[PDB]
Design a protein around this ligand. Structure first.
Ligand SMILES: NNC(=O)c1cnc2ccc(F)cc2c1N
Length: 154
């Protein structure tokens, strides 16, 4: 029982793009861009679609950097999150109903206003290492269990 999601990180030499989630699940946290993958689109299609919906940005190339599985206690579907990075973007990011985008210096990541699991796996993304992760949550604050490792193939 799993469902595909995407997560897109615009990572440039000295800054990373994040959006403050305005509504929905996990609102009030700085997030990457992404969401559910729809029927009839590839995972990467879905990633590019969510990026454009949430920020207006398009990209020449997205690169697979990771995969994270989330379990929430009592919820039947696991989240199968495919994580992507890009450096070159096309456009200037703008606010959507869902996300307010801002750039952050790579030593000023707002981990305290981000999902707790970000503190574990995001530095690996910043270090340009591919990774597989698993995080078990009870609610949105408490990691009950996790595994994390670098991988050669995402
Ligand atoms: N940049 N990080 C995210 O956007 C992010 C990180 N962890 C999560 C864990 C569970 C979940 F439902 C969402 C996220 C998430 N969006």
């Amino acid at each position: 029982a799993s469902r595909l999601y995407t997560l897109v990180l615009v990572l440039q030499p000295q800054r990373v793009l994040l959006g403050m989630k305005k509504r929905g699940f996990g609102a009030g946290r700085w997030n990457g861009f992404g969401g559910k993958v729809q029927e009839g689109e590839t995972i990467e299609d879905g990633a590019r679609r969510e990026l454009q919906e949430e920020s207006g940005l398009t990209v020449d190339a997205l690169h697979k950097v990771g995969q994270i599985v989330f379990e929430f206690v009592g919820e039947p579907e696991l989240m199968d999150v495919h994580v992507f990075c890009t450096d070159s973007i096309q456009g200037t990011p703008v606010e959507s109903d869902e996300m307010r985008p801002c750039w952050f210096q790579l030593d000023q990541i707002p981990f305290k206003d981000m999902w707790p699991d970000d503190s574990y796996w995001f530095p690996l993304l910043l270090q340009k290492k591919k990774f597989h992760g698993y995080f078990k949550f009870q609610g949105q604050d408490t990691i009950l269990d996790y595994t994390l490792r670098e991988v050669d193939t995402v």
